[PDB]
Amino acid sequence: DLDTHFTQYKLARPYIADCPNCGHSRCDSPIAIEEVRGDAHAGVIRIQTSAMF
Amino acid sequence: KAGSFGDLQSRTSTSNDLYANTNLKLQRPQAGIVHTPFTQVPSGFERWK
Amino acid sequence: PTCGAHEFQCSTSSCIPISWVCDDDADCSDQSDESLEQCGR
Ligand SMILES: [Ca+2]
Numbered sequence: 001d002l003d004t005h006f007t008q009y010k011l012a013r014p015y016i017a018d019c020p021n022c023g024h025s026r027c028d029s030p031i032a033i034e035e036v037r038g039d040a041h042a043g044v045i046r047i048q049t050s051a052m053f
Numbered sequence: 054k055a056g057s058f059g060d061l062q063s064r065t066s067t068s069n070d071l072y073a074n075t076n077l078k079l080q081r082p083q084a085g086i087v088h089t090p091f092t093q094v095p096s097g098f099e100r101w102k
Numbered sequence: 103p104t105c106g107a108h109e110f111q112c113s114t115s116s117c118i119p120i121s122w123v124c125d126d127d128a129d130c131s132d133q134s135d136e137s138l139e140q141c142g143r
Pocket residue numbers: 122123124125126127128129130135
């Protein structure tokens with residue numbers, strides 16, 4: 001079921017954390033790139049952010 | 054040696070024990086923002102490959 | 103044959119976990135999981 005993968009994700013929320021270089025001057029943004037992982041074999045990467053998709 | 058081959062040695066694939074030296078060092082956060090910046094030598098397994 | 107209690111067999115001795123059924127993904131080779139009967143869509 002699609003709902004089985006979201007049972008513990010309904011209890012979570014987005015957050016605002018700082019990240020450098022939104023525009024020019026290191027904002028506080030709803031999108032905040034944390035822990036980019038790039039150890040695959042065809043240039044496919046996984047990006048963890050603060051927003052909820 | 055923190056950068057050569059054995060900077061992360063675990064006795065089996067799911068061991069709770071884990072030996073790891075990586076020359077981790079914490080730095081001061083700057084100019085009034087909340088983050089934890091650190092500094093460590095890169096991976097010795099990646100350098101071995 | 104049949105698979106275990108934590109696996110749902112699609113067809114031709116290839117089984118997937120129980121949460122992997124009707125989850126918008128045709129994981130099985132015969133795509134039996136999302137069929138209108140098991141999924142109803
Ligand atoms: Ca599926």
